[PDB]
Amino acid sequence: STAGKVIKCKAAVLWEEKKPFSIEEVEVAPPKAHEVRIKMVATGICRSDDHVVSGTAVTPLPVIAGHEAAGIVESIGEGVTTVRPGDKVIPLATPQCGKCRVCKHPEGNFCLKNDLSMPRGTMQDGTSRFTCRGKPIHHFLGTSTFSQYTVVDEISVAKIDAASPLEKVCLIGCGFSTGYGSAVKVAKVTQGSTCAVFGLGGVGLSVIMGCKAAGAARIIGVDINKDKFAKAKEVGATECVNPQDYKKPIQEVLTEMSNGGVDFSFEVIGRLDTMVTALSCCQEAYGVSVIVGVPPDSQNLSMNPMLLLSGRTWKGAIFGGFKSKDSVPKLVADFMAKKFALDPLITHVLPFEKINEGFDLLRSGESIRTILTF
Amino acid sequence: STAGKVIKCKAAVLWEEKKPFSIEEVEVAPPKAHEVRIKMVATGICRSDDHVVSGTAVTPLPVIAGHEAAGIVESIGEGVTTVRPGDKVIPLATPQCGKCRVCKHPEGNFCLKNDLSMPRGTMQDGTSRFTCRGKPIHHFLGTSTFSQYTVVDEISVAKIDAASPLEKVCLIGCGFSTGYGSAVKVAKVTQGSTCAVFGLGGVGLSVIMGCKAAGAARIIGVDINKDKFAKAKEVGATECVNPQDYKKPIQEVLTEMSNGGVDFSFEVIGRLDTMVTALSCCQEAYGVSVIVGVPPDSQNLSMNPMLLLSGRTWKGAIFGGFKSKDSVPKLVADFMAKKFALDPLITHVLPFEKINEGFDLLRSGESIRTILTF
Ligand SMILES: NC(=O)C1=CN([C@@H]2O[C@H](COP(=O)(O)OP(=O)(O)OC[C@H]3O[C@@H](n4cnc5c(N)ncnc54)[C@H](O)[C@@H]3O)[C@@H](O)[C@H]2O)C=CC1
Ligand SMILES: NC(=O)C1=CN([C@@H]2O[C@H](COP(=O)(O)OP(=O)(O)OC[C@H]3O[C@@H](n4cnc5c(N)ncnc54)[C@H](O)[C@@H]3O)[C@@H](O)[C@H]2O)C=CC1
Ligand SMILES: O=CNC1CCCCC1
Ligand SMILES: O=CNC1CCCCC1
Ligand SMILES: [Zn+2]
Ligand SMILES: [Zn+2]
Ligand SMILES: [Zn+2]
Ligand SMILES: [Zn+2]
């Protein structure tokens, strides 16, 4: 019915920063060589999407944001070999070209074809497939899932099991895999260790799930919103602390609580001051701290390098360290085999047309993940 | 003859910052329980000793500095079981109490009994064994080797092979083990990798030795003193670069040479701006950078956390990550089996009485290690 022809559908267009999303009709071009056009089934609201609205993350505007999603292939361009029409797929905000030095490295996953380091907001070929009111619209991280239809490059999409529940496994496209892998793969949390998780949203709850799966004995959740603590304990936190309850800096509180520092800390908020605090609260001689949260654009933190000279390890990761096209299908298969749970992250399910209500839920602190359904 | 008695001997006392050492008579008390009095045989001049003179590293003054050394036990206090009179020994600037959480951890080595985090300039019991002109003199890192005799706590000394050449193996007390271990143990340099070493003094040359021992394919030495390059190449550097030779910043220069960034980088100078440069020059997705150099006291560096979010790992270490009392004797044994070489590090030999000439050689850039003989 639509193969090869332009599709008119609705999408949520962000024309300016700090504005509501504009739900209107867009035109989606057919896929070119090695491109895939996807009909969306579900998309999650990740804080990184809100970072585009707030100016925390800079990407060319106007844009169709959205990147944590799942859908069904509508058509494929010339040369595509990894997916076919009717396939269930998850778009990959971090691609896996399989040919760059990073793709070939055994540990690396930040493929050099990403659109994060130098945001261009296009397809790999430098152009856009979206038009709205006659204007070209930018892509976001080579995904753009806030639309009934999107076009992605083949290296930015993974085929998943045909029996997958797409309204749950869309979280494997970002939030869950980021937090879970940050714990089990990047930090490599050890059994019986003490962990501190700063930020108890969708990604931080997934960090806790990973720390628990790795066998940590203590998991301390840190959040200034005490309404987050109940769910954090349900997924594995042993204790929760609110920094605003203390006179003392929270790094000093965590050090005392852990009898000299935690084994692993995670910053899953996106604040410079909490990145330094999370590093300081891990044990000075053998602690490991992982940055997951995204800081405001172009801002530098300040820290004393003696925190590292004593023995600490500080690292960060995109997408939990997972090689995206390899790992996403295996994570879906693991989910299906009930190896982990996604329902604790899903607090709200709304129709796509209520996208703005979903972001209001996030900004107000009331939601973890809202899933938008098409 | 001297057991149980105060020993009057000559030491290099630092009365004030930024002044020459004063070679003069001190009184060295006999060792108390679990203390060891050592007759010094040789001590190296490490940049960290000069950091005490310049105020870069703060420890209470007046002080007997020196920490990279080897000697012979003169007497032991009550309860000492690990060393006896006449034993050859190396003092440990980082102790190994064997009982704290760090000593019990498999990776950690920054024993909580250290005198670095919160310098007191005393023995473990809070007192001093040194008197000069009737005044108490501080210790340095629980070692104080710029003296014909010193007293150290049992956890700060290791017995070594009775046939050891003390005028060479004193370097295993700091410089060599720090650089070598930073490469083979902290970074865990892999075979065929590309390394960048910032700073080609005694410790940076030892990092190069460790990178070569690990099988690195390329080892890029970085120094603003081009006179350091010849020796760096002799011990394993494949290329040397002087940042002052380029119209662009050296991290860009190293990123171009490594076709996208190095596998392992090492800061072995002690400058805030080169710590950030060394981190920036590794692969953004899988590179590892190790801080070895000592920053000026209490100064903060400034960096963009996106350097870590992409996947980099940043860490630091004291003494190359080696558990000091376990490792020093083994390193001496390996040296005697010619598993590594120390002669390339020793450029100057002076009598202890010419200590100020030895520091002039270091400050002028002419020496790597000057060994002082008592
Ligand atoms: N590295 C990566 O690959 C990815 C990174 N992210 C980033 O991770 C971060 C978290 O994402 P979500 O979980 O979706 O966000 P979220 O907004 O749902 O969670 C943030 C949590 O931090 C808490 N918080 C805010 N300020 C705080 C403070 N000063 N102290 C303690 N807690 C504080 C909030 O109460 C909230 O619960 C965001 O910055 C996002 O951009 C998200 C996905 C992938
Ligand atoms: N972590 C630890 O356990 C230890 C740390 N250290 C520290 O390591 C550092 C090096 O010690 P040494 O090798 O003994 O010192 P060193 O002074 O002999 O070597 C430093 C080298 O850095 C070079 N350099 C200076 N400024 C530079 C710049 N802007 N760019 C490039 N190169 C520059 C100098 O030309 C010199 O060759 C010192 O800061 C020392 O305190 C030393 C021993 C143990
Ligand atoms: O949330 C998905 N991706 C993120 C990764 C970190 C930078 C902002 C975008
Ligand atoms: O050089 C020996 N020890 C050093 C270790 C890093 C801080 C200054 C002292
Ligand atoms: Zn996301
Ligand atoms: Zn790639
Ligand atoms: Zn100890
Ligand atoms: Zn030293």
Coordinates of C-alpha atoms in Angstrom, one line a residue, chain A residues 43-49 67-68 170-171 173-178 201-206 228 231 342-350 358 361-362 366-372:
Chain A
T43 CA 7.9 4.6 22.5
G44 CA 9.2 5.5 25.9
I45 CA 9.8 9.0 27.3
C46 CA 13.5 9.1 28.4
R47 CA 15.0 12.1 30.2
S48 CA 17.4 12.5 27.3
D49 CA 14.4 13.5 25.1
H67 CA 14.7 7.2 20.5
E68 CA 13.6 4.5 22.9
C170 CA 10.9 -0.6 23.8
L171 CA 12.7 0.1 27.1
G173 CA 16.1 0.5 23.3
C174 CA 17.5 2.8 25.9
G175 CA 16.6 3.1 29.6
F176 CA 16.7 -0.5 30.9
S177 CA 19.8 -1.6 28.9
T178 CA 21.7 1.6 29.8
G201 CA 14.4 7.3 37.6
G202 CA 14.0 4.8 34.9
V203 CA 17.7 4.4 34.3
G204 CA 18.7 4.4 38.0
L205 CA 16.1 1.7 38.8
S206 CA 17.7 -0.3 36.0
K228 CA 11.1 7.5 44.4
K231 CA 10.0 1.6 43.9
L342 CA 10.4 -4.3 32.8
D343 CA 7.0 -3.7 34.3
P344 CA 8.5 -2.0 37.5
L345 CA 9.8 0.8 35.2
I346 CA 6.4 1.4 33.5
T347 CA 4.3 3.7 35.6
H348 CA 2.1 5.2 32.8
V349 CA 0.8 4.2 29.4
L350 CA -0.7 6.8 27.3
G358 CA 3.9 12.3 29.4
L361 CA 4.5 13.6 34.3
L362 CA 8.3 13.2 34.0
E366 CA 5.3 11.6 39.1
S367 CA 6.4 9.1 36.5
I368 CA 9.3 6.7 35.9
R369 CA 8.7 5.6 32.3
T370 CA 5.6 6.6 30.4
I371 CA 5.1 4.4 27.3
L372 CA 3.4 6.1 24.4

